[PDB]
Amino acid sequence: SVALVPHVGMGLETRTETWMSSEGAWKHAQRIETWVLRHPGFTIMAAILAYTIGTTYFQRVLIFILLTAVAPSMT
């Protein structure tokens, strides 16, 4: 759908506020937070998988963050 191609990082952004700046700023973060609240099971699985895959604690946190972000993002 058109709604999945937000036209955000295209550049050509000037000092004037863009269309739906205030909302689109945090809409994705709100959506991810709502998904993480409504699907606590998958978050635990992602935490366990990140704990297993990554040796360095930074690697584990990075994998956990990426996996949690991509989980609802596909859906």
Contact positions toward its own copies, by CB under 8 A? 1, 3-6, 8-9, 27-28, 31, 35, 53-56, 58-59, 62-63, 66-67, 69-70, 72-75
Helix, strand, coil percentages, rounded to 5, for the chain: 70, 0, 30
CA distance 74 to 4: 11
Binding status of residue 21 toward other proteins by CB under 8 A: yes
Interatomic CA distance for residues 39 and 6, integer angstroms: 25
Tell me which residues touch other proteins (CB under 8 A). 1-25, 28-29, 34-35, 38-39, 41-42, 44-45, 49, 52-53, 58, 62, 65, 70-72, 74-75
